[PDB]
Amino acid sequence: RPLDIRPNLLVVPTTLRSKAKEVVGVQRLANGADNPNFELVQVLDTAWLN
Amino acid sequence: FMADEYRYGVRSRCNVGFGFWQLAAMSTEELNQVNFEKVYDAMRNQKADGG
């Protein structure tokens, strides 16, 4: 019986914040492509890890 | 005619500033997060005198 998982959090170090925000935070891609992963998961940036 | 003044510059703190040696911005992929925001991230990543 499969399990219902709804990922809504993305935790990354401060060194990956740029990539995390450009995956979730960018609305247009290329010369206009929407973004299927825009605001799908909210990101928090922390300095304790790494 | 003369001017007189008492002053001198200061260093605020060693770990609150940065200067890099490149700025190209060609297509905003050479330095967007390679050397312009790389320093931004470096400032984001620092540790005090307690680990």
A15·B37 Cβ contact <8 A? no
Phi-psi region of A35 (alpha: psi -120 to 50; beta: other; left: phi over 0): beta
Could you tell me the resolution of this structure in angstroms? 2.6
Experimental determination technique:
cryo-EM
Residues 1-50 of A with CB under 8 A from B: 13-15, 17-19, 45, 47
Give the tokens for residue B35. 């050397």
- CB within 8 Å of B36: residues ≥ 6 apart: B20, B23, B25
Give the tokens for residue B4. 């007189």
> Which residue in this structure is represented by tokens 């390679």?
B34
Please name every residue paired with B50 in a beta bridge, in sequence order, or none if there are none.
none
- Chain B residues whose CB is inside 8 A of the A14 CB are 41, 44-45
Cα–Cα dist B34/A47, whole Å: 20
Give the number of other CB atoms < 10 A from CB of residue B13.
6
Please name every residue paired with A11 in a beta bridge, in sequence order, or none if there are none.
A44
Is A42 within 8 Å of A9 (Cβ atoms)? yes
CA of B10, closest CA in chain A: separation in Å? 29
Is A43 within 8 Å of A12 (Cβ atoms)? yes
- Is the Cα dihedral A38, A25, A15, A43 positive or negative? negative
Cα–Cα dist B40/B15, whole Å: 12
- CB within 8 Å of B45: residues ≥ 6 apart: A13, A14, A15, A47
